[PDB]
């Protein structure tokens, strides 16, 4: 899903966004809350195709940051691909209140056998992006755990390859 996006920069000269270079592409690494980025809808894993009509292809992360830093004007224009490689898995808690997977640093590392996670095809080495529509990127494992345990029996998670 490709969409265009226009940011109006802060009070303190910034848009609240850090990017990373992966395989000659540019991706949203971190979105600060209530930032110009947040208002517009940017998320971890979103791909930045161009900034101000200039292709991001092959850029270093540092470079993308210089380009965003040396931004002429208060408005920044970004062509965006909505997070690619994303998946969604809906699981159901069992009697013990588990869905059946282990995680560590927001990443799913193993799938418990014969669990809801197994029958619904949860993947390993994937980050946990949203839980029941609620963002958890940047949260500590304990916070994620609380969101999980305070959810109902239905647990729908959006994940993404690490």
């Amino acid at each position: 899903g490709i969409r265009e996006v226009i940011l109006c920069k802060d009070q303190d000269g910034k848009i609240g966004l850090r990017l990373k270079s992966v395989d000659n592409g540019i991706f949203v690494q971190l979105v600060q809350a209530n930032s110009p980025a947040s208002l517009v809808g940017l998320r971890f894993g979103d791909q930045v195709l161009q900034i101000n009509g200039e292709n991001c292809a092959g850029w270093s992360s540092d470079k993308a940051h210089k380009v965003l830093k040396q931004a002429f004007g208060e408005k920044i224009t970004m062509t965006i691909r909505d997070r690619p490689f994303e998946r969604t898995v809906t699981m159901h808690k069992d009697s013990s209140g588990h869905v059946g997977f282990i995680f560590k640093s927001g990443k799913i590392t193993s799938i418990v056998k014969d669990s809801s996670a197994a029958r619904n095809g949860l993947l390993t080495d994937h980050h946990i992006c949203e839980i029941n529509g609620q963002n958890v990127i940047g949260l500590k494992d304990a916070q994620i755990a609380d969101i999980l345990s305070t959810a109902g029996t239905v647990v729908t998670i959006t994940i993404m390859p690490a």
Binding site: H98, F101, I102, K104, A117, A142
Partner: peptide, 8 residues
């Protein structure tokens, strides 16, 4: 050391 792993 702790494994710091979580179970869901």
């Amino acid at each position: 050391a702790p494994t710091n792993e979580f179970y869901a």
